[PDB]
mmCIF file of N, CA and C and ligand atoms in Angstrom:
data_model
loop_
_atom_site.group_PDB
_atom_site.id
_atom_site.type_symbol
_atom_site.label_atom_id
_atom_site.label_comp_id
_atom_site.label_asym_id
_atom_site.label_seq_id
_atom_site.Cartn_x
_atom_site.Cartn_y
_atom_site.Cartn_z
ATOM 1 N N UNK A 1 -1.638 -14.610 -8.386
ATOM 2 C CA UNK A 1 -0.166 -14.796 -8.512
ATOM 3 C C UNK A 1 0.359 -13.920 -9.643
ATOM 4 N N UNK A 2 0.834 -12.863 -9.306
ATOM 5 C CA UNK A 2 1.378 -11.753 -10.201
ATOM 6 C C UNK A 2 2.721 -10.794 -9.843
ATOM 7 N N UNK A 3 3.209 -10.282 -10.460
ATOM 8 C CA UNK A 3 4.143 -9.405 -10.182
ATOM 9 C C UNK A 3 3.810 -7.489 -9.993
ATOM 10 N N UNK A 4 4.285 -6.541 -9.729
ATOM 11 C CA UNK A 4 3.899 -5.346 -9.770
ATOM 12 C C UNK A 4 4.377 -4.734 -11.461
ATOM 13 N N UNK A 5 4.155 -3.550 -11.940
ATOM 14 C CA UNK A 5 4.832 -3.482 -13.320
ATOM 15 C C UNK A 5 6.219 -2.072 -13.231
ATOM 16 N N UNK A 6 6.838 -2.872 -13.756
ATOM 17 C CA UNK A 6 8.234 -1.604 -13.683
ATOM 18 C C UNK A 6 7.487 -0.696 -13.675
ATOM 19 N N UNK A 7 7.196 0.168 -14.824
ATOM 20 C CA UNK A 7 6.845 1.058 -15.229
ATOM 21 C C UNK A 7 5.869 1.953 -13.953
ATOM 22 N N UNK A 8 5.433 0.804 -13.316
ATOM 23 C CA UNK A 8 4.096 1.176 -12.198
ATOM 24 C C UNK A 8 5.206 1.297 -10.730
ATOM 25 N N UNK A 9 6.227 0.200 -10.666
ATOM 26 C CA UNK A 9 6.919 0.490 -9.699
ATOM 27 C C UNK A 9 7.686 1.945 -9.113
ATOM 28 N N UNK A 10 7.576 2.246 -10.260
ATOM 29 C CA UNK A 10 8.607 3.775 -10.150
ATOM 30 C C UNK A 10 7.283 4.911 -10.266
ATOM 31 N N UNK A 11 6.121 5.055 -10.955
ATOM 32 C CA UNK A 11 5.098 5.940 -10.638
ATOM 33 C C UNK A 11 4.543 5.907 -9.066
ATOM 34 N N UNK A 12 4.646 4.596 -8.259
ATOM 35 C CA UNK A 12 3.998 4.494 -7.138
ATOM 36 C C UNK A 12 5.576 5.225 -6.245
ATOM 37 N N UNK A 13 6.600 4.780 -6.510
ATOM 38 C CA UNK A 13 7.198 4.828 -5.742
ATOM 39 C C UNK A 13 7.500 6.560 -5.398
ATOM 40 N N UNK A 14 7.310 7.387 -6.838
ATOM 41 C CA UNK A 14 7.630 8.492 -6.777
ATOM 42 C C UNK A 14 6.054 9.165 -6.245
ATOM 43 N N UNK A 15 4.976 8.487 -6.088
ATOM 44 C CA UNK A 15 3.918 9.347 -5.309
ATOM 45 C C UNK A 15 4.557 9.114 -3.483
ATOM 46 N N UNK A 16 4.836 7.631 -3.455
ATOM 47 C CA UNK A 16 5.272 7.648 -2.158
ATOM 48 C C UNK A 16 6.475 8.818 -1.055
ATOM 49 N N UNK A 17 7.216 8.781 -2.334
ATOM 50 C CA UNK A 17 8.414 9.397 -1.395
ATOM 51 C C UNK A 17 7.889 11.166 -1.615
ATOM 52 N N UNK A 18 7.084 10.781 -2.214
ATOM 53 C CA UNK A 18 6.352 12.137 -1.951
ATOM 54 C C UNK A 18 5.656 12.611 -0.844
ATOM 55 N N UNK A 19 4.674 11.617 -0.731
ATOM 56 C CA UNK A 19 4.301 11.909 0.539
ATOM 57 C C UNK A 19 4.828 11.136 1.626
ATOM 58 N N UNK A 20 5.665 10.658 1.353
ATOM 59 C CA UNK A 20 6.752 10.353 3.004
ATOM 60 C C UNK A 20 7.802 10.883 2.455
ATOM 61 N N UNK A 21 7.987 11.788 3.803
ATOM 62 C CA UNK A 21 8.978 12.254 4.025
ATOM 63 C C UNK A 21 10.024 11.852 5.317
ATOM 64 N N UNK A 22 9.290 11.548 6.048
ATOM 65 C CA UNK A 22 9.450 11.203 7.176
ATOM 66 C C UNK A 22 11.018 10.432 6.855
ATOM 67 N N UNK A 23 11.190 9.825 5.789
ATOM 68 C CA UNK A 23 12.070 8.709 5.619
ATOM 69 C C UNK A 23 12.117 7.813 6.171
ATOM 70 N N UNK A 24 11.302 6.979 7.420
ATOM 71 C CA UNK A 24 10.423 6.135 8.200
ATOM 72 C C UNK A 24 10.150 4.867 6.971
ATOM 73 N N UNK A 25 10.487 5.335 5.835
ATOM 74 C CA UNK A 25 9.976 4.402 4.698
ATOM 75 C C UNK A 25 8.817 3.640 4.785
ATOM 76 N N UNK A 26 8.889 3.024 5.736
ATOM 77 C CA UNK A 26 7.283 2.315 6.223
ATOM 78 C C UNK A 26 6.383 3.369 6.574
ATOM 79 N N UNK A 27 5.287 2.785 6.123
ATOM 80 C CA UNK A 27 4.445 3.426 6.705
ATOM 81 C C UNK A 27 2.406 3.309 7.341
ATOM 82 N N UNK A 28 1.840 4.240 7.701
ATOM 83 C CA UNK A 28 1.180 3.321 8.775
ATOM 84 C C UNK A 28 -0.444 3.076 7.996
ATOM 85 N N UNK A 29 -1.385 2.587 8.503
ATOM 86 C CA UNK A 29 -2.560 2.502 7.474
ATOM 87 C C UNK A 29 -3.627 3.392 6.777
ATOM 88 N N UNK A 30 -3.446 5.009 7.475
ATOM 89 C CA UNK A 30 -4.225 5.902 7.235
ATOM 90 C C UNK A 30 -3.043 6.187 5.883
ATOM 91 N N UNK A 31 -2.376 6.761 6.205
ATOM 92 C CA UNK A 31 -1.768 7.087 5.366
ATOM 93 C C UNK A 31 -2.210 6.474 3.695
ATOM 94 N N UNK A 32 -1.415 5.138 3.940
ATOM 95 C CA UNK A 32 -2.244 4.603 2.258
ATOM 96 C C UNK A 32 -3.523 5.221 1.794
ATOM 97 N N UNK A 33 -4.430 4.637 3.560
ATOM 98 C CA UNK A 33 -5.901 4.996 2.968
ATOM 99 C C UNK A 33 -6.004 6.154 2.415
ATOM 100 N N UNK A 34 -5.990 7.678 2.599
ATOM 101 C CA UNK A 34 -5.830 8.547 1.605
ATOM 102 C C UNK A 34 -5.442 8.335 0.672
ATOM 103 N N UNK A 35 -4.269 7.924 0.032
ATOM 104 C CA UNK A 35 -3.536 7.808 -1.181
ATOM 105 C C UNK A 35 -4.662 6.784 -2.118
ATOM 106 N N UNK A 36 -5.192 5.630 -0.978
ATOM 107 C CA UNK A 36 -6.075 5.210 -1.978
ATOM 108 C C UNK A 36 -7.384 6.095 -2.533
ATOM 109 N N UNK A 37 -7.758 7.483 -1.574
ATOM 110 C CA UNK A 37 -8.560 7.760 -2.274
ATOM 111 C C UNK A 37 -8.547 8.925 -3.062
ATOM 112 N N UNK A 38 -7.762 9.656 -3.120
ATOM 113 C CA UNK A 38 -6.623 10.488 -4.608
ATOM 114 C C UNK A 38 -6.300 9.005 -5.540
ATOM 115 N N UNK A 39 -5.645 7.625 -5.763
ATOM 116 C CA UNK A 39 -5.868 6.737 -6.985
ATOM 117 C C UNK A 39 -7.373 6.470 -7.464
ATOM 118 N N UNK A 40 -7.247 7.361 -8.636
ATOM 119 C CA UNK A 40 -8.548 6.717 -9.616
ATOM 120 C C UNK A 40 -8.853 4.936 -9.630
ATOM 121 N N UNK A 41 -9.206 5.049 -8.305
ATOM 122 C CA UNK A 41 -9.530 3.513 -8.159
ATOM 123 C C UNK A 41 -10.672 3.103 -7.310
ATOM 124 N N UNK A 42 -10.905 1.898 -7.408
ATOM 125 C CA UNK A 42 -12.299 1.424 -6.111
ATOM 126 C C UNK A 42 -12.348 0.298 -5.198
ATOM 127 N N UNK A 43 -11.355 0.097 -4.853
ATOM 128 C CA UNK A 43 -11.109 -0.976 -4.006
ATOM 129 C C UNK A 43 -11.683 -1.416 -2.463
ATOM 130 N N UNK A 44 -12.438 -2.711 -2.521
ATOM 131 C CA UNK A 44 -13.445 -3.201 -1.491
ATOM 132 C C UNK A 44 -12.529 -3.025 -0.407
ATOM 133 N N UNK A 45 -13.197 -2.070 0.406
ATOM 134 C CA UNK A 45 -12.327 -1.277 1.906
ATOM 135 C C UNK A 45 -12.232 -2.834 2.615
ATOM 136 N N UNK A 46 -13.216 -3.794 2.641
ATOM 137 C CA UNK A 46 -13.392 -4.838 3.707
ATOM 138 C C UNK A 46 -12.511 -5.826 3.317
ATOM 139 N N UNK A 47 -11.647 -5.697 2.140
ATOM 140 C CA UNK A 47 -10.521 -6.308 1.807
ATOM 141 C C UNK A 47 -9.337 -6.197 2.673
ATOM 142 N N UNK A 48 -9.218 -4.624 2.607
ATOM 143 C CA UNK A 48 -8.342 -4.088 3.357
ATOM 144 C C UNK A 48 -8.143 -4.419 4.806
ATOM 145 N N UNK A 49 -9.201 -4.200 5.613
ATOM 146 C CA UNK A 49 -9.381 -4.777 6.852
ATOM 147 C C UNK A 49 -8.468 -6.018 7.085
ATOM 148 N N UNK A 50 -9.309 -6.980 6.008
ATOM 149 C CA UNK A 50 -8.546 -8.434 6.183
ATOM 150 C C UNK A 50 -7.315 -8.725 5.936
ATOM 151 N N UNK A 51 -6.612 -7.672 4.573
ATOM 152 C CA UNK A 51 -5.409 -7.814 4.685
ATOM 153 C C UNK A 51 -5.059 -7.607 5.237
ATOM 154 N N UNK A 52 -4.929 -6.181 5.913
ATOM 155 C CA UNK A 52 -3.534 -5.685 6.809
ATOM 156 C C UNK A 52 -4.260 -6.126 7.972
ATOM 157 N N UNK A 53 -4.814 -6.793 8.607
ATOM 158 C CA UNK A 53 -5.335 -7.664 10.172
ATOM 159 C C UNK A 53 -4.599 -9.201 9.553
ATOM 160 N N UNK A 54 -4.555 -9.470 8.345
ATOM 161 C CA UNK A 54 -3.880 -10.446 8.016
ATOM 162 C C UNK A 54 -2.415 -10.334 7.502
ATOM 163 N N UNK A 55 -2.056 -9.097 7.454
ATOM 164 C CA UNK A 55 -0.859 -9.158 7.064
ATOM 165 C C UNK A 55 0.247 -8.553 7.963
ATOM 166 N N UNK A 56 -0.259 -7.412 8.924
ATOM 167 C CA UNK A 56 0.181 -6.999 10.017
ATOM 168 C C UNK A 56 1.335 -7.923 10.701
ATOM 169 N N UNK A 57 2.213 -8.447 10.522
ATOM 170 C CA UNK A 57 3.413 -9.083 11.049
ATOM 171 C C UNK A 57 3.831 -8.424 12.126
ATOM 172 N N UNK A 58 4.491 -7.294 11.855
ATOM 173 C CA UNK A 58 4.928 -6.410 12.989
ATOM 174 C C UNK A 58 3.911 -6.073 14.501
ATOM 175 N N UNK A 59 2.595 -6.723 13.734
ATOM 176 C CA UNK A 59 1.280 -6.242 14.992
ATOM 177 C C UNK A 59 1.475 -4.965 15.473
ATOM 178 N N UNK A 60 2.546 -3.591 14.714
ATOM 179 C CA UNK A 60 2.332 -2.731 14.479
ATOM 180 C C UNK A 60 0.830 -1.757 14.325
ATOM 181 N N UNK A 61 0.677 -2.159 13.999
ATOM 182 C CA UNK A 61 -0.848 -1.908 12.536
ATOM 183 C C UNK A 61 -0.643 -0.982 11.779
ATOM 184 N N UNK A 62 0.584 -1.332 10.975
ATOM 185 C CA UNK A 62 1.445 -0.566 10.270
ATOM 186 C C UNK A 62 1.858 -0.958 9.089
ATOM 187 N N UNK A 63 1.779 -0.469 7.752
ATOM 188 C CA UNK A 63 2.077 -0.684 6.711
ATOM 189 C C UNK A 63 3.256 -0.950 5.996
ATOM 190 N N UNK A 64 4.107 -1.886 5.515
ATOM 191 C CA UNK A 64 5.395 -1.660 5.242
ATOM 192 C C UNK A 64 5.534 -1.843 3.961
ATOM 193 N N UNK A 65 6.780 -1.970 3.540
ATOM 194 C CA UNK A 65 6.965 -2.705 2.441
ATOM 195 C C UNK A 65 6.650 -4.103 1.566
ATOM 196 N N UNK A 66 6.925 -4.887 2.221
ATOM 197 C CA UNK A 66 6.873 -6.056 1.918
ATOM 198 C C UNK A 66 5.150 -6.510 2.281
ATOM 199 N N UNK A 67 5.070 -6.073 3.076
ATOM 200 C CA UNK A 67 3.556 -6.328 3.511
ATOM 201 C C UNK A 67 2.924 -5.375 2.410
ATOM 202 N N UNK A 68 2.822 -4.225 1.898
ATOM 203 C CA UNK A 68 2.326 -4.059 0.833
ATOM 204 C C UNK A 68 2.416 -4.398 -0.576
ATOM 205 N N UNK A 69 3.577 -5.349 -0.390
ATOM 206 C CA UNK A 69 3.789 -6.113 -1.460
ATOM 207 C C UNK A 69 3.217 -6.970 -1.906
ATOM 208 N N UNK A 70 2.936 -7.882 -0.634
ATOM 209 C CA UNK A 70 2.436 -8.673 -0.485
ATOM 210 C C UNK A 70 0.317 -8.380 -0.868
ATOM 211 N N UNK A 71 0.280 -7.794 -0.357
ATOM 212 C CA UNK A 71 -1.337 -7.485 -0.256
ATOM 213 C C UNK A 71 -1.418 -7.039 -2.096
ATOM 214 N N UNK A 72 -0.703 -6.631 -2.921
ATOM 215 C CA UNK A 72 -0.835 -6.563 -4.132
ATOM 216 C C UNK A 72 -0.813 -8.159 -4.227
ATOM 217 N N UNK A 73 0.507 -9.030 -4.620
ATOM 218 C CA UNK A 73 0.525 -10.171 -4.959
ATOM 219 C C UNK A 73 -0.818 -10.887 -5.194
ATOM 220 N N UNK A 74 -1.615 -10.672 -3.571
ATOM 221 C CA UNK A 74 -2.752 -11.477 -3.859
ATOM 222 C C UNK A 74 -3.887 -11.109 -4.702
ATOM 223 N N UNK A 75 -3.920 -9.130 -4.019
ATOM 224 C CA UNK A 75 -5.115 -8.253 -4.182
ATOM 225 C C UNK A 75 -5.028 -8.564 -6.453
ATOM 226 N N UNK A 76 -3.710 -8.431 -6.583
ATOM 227 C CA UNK A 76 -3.749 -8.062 -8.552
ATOM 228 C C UNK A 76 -3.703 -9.594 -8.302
HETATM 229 MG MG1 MG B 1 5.545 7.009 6.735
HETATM 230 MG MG1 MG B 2 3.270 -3.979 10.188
#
């Protein structure tokens, strides 16, 4: 139970609209996955699975906003 950090909100947001262009704003699961692996980070892929198979609302299998919001909330 956490929040995201200003400071972090506006660094993520400005890698995002970087690489979307599309203006689609949402966007789909490969996509992140790269971005996660350019972030100096290590995050259990089999997490991922479960989130977005658990968070997938749209049954898209597509990444959005709020649904990546969400998958922080729990993931931090
Ligand atoms: Mg997109
Ligand atoms: Mg979706």
């Amino acid at each position: 139970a956490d929040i995201l950090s200003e400071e972090q909100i506006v660094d993520f947001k400005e890698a995002f609209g970087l690489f979307d262009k599309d203006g689609d704003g949402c966007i789909t699961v490969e996509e992140l996955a790269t971005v996660i692996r350019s972030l100096d980070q290590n995050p259990t892929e089999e997490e991922l699975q479960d989130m977005i198979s658990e968070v997938d609302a749209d049954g898209n299998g597509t990444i959005e906003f709020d649904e990546f919001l969400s998958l922080m909330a729990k993931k931090v």
